[PDB]
Amino acid sequence: DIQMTQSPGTLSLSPGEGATLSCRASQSVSSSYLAWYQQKPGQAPRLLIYGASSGATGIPDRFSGSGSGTDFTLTISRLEPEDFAVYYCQQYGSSPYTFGQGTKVEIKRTVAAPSVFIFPPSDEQLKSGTASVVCLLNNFYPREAKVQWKVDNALQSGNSQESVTEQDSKDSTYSLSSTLTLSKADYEKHKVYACEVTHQGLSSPVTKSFNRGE
Amino acid sequence: DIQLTQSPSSLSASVGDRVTITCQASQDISNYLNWYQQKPGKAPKLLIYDASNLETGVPSRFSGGGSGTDFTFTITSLQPEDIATYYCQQYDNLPLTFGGGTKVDIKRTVAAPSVFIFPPSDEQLKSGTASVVCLLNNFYPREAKVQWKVDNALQSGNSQESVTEQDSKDSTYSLSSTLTLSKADYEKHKVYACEVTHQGLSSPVTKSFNR
Amino acid sequence: QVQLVQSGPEVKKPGTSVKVSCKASGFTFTTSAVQWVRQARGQRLEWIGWIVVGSGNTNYAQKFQERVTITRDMSTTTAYMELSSLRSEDTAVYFCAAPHCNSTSCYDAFDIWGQGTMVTVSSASTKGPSVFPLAPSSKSTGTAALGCLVKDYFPEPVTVSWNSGALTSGVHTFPAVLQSSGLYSLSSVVTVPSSSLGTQTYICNVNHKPSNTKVDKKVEPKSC
Amino acid sequence: QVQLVESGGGVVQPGRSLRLSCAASGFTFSTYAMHWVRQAPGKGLEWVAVLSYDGSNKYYADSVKGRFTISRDNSKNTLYLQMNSLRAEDTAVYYCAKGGSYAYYYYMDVWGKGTTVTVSSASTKGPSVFPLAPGGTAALGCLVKDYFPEPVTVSWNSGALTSGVHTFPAVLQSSGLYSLSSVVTVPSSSLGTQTYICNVNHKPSNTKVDKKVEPK
Amino acid sequence: HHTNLCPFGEVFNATRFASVYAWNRKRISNCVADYSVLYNSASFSTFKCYGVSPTKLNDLCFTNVYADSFVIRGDEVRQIAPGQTGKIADYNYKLPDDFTGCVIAWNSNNLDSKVGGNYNYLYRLFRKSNLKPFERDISTEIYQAGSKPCNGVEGFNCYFPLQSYGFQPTNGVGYQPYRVVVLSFELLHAPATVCGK
Ligand SMILES: *[C@@H]1O[C@H](CO[C@@H]2O[C@@H](C)[C@@H](O)[C@@H](O)[C@@H]2O)[C@@H](O[C@@H]2O[C@H](CO)[C@@H](O)[C@H](O)[C@H]2NC(C)=O)[C@H](O)[C@H]1NC(C)=O
Ligand SMILES: *[C@@H]1O[C@H](CO[C@@H]2O[C@@H](C)[C@@H](O)[C@@H](O)[C@@H]2O)[C@@H](O)[C@H](O)[C@H]1NC(C)=O
Ligand SMILES: [Cl-]
Ligand SMILES: [Cl-]
Ligand SMILES: [Cl-]
Ligand SMILES: [Cl-]
Ligand SMILES: [Cl-]
């Protein structure tokens, strides 16, 4: 089987810059059977380039393709707002028709620190027997961020789950949601609940906390 | 292309004999084979179609058999008007291709050729060209070989030959060979001869003249 | 109107089979070919196999040779992908693709793509979500944050709006996470001016069609 | 009564062009496929080209591909063969033949009488007649050399001497002109009391030569 | 030509039949045909004649008769007729609009079906253009469905033009093999050699 590898994983560029994406094959593939796809979140792949260097019907001429043998390139001359998405390459000359791992093209923004909020579990949920503590990181860039739960200054692990939104279409920021899940018994055994947020936009880790009940 | 191989390329039989010639195909052609008869001067005429079936009007003495690659063509009782060349033709796919042909001859007693040599006429030598003629008159079978000798030197590439049809009365052939030299080359040599080798001759016969 | 329309969502228990359809329209189906591609949430596109419509000849990836059969019915101009012995790792969106063709010629790539079919494999059963408020803190003077916790539901998806759609600015609804219990949890937050915390009402509208659950929840600052 | 009549054959220079035509009768020509077949002098039969009923599909032999073009005019019930870039090996008798029903190119039923195409840059020239001057029986004859085009007719004593006459078929010399010989065997007794004359007649050049053959 | 029955037995009762893409033609000439026996025979699923009444066939004379034979499946028998479209009529066997003759077909499941499936019979699946009437195409060149050349290997938009039939005993009647014989009657301005008695 032919292995397809793409680079870079993520491309951070400003709207107006040029984009250059790489797709490499573990062995020679026929250039007439190499395709580029564009995929936006929640959508199906859309054919951009086929035969390495042929644009598909309806594709703006700002999309350019080149390559032969093992090395292929997708080039976007002027990055438009609607062009920020994930891009896959697929060879379909030798079966199986393998895909690359994809390249995300995001908007490069000025560094923005996250606004941190912590939410105690509601009284209604504590009746159910489970407690959920939520830590919100609002509108930051870049996407890399770290959330650390501390229960009475005791480092927690294995009891939290995270989730990130897509890059916002207006301010090019990301937002993160971390949920600490404890039983009602465990939750009432402690007092200070805090989430520590580490991010490039913060000179030092910012901590938001609350005392149980107060 | 499909290649057809006829066997034999020529044969001799007497009236009343049963003649059989074969046609082998390079690949399976089902029964898509035609057999043609072509008499000298005229166009080929179809005798057998679909390998086995008789064309309209063709006498019942002609027949054919086979399917796939190996085919046969038969004349049960050879007749005087059956002396011609016979071709097989495939039509399984394009291009349509024929066999090499089989010339059917009348068998008769072996007759040695009567060899005559003719020096070039004085009227022709005045024009600057010399043509020596060697005649092989009334012989059988048709196969004959003539080699020219100019002062003990075998000639090649400077002579042409012509053979008549089989005589309808004595069943013999006649061959004419002409050696064409320039008058200059004709005046430089003295001994001109044609050596005739034939089945009827136990040894080659040479007719020569001194210029 | 050259199109490829796939089946609806599927929720199968582990070990069962699923058969996703892919109906073609707008082009000549008989001379084209259909490939099948799946994609887990947040992961890459993975090739399963393909079928030539005219001949029915198929090729499958090594991973799916054991459990996948790709077929097609030319009378109903539809292609199918049947994946047996389902397990949790098979939970993904499944796409079909094909080149458009007339009676003789075909496009030189898979330029037609279906909308996709979401297939879920787990032992959980249908359950509507519990909606708990994320009350705004007593901070700043300044913007505050509030939201709704959409917890313990199955299967995907839920849809969340605020003030029946009258509030969209500052809203962030995160992708759900699959808890170890096999149930999903989702949170929706919105940032608002601290001045409006007392005079503006905030209700989140959570809708979970698989369970026919419509929950409206009012999010107020904590009452001490 | 299926009949095919060819025309347009004659002398043509090497590298020049010639177009044959074939007139069909006895069947719906517009529905049937058509063939061309040729036969070089002293050679076998060679298939040339085939045309479909409507004239849109054409198939040729490699020996003539890119040089010959087969066409048809169904309104005139005739089949054409445009011959371009002619070579000496194209010298042959050309026949048309009725093919199969529509696009069934595999039949070659009725053949035409045939038209003769001779590829030569030579010009019409009368023959030079030289005598072949003369055991118990002697042989004498006439050399009909350097003529073009075919044919010539040779008789002896205006047709009186027919026994033992052998008029050989002509050969094509490297000059492009034909050479022919006609011999007759006579008893040596009558060599001194009977004169022999060959009557060479060459219609294309309007030549009639009567040559007296004498001993030396 | 007068004292010999036309060898229709060699066509209908032939041991082996051809694939429709390589359909076989046999010329029937110089014989006497008995068409009524075939027309009233209870062994034929199809006996549709075009341009000639089958009841008055024993009263007609023709210069030549040609018999085309092959194997298709039942639901494809409807395509062996003038003015039809489909995989068989477009790419395998095409009748002209002015076809004069008879199309005969019968179920050959007991002969052309194997236990594990008979895969000897083939049919053409793709072609650049439709066949002209009475055209035969036996080429096995890779069909190029796209703009890129195939180089003699199959792949995307490069498919082998011939496909094999299934033909298993348990198939539906519409999918079972049928043997087809297409008699076409040729009438030239020549002595008629095939008459009915
Ligand atoms: C069938 O389509 C071919 C090709 O058309 C192109 O390729 C298709 C896959 C699709 O992308 C179409 O939108 C394209 O236009 C036709 O052949 C072409 O015809 C055009 C104009 O008729 C001509 O300019 C091209 O040179 C042709 N190319 C080839 C390779 O033939 C063909 O005519 C179509 N047939 C029918 C019946 O619609
Ligand atoms: C087909 O054959 C039928 C019977 O023919 C006899 O049996 C077959 C199996 C052979 O052995 C054959 O030699 C025998 O004579 C006929 O009754 C029937 O008419 C034939 N069909 C046609 C169309 O000729
Ligand atoms: Cl893949
Ligand atoms: Cl004869
Ligand atoms: Cl958002
Ligand atoms: Cl063509
Ligand atoms: Cl025309």
Numbering used by the authors:
A (entry chain G): 1 to 214
B (entry chain B): 1 to 211
C (entry chain F): 1 to 141, 144 to 226
D (entry chain A): 1 to 134, 141 to 222
E (entry chain R): 331 to 527
Would you copy out the relevant sentences from the publication that reported this structure?
The Spike protein (S) is the major surface glycoprotein on coronaviruses. These characteristically trimeric spikes are subdivided into an N-terminal S1 domain, responsible for attachment to host cells via its receptor ACE2 (Hoffmann et al., 2020), and a C-terminal S2 domain, which is anchored in the viral membrane, cleaved from S1 following cellular attachment, and responsible for membrane fusion and cell entry. S1 consists of an N-terminal domain (NTD) followed by the receptor binding domain (RBD) which mediates binding to ACE2, burying ∼860 Å of surface area at its tip (Lan et al., 2020). Most potent neutralizing antibodies bind the RBD on or closely adjacent to the ACE2-interacting surface and function to block interaction of the virus with ACE2, preventing cellular adhesion and infection (Dejnirattisai et al., 2021a; Yuan et al., 2020; Kreye et al., 2020).
The third crystal structure is closely related; it is a ternary complex of Fab 253 with RBD-T478K and Fab 45. In addition, comparison of the overall mode of engagement of mAb 253 between the two differently mutated RBDs reveals that the 478 mutation induces a modest change in the pose of the antibody. In the T478K mutant RBD, the lysine folds back away from the antibody (J). The light chain of mAb 253 contacts RBD residue T478, and the change at 478 enhances the binding/neutralization of B.1.617.2.
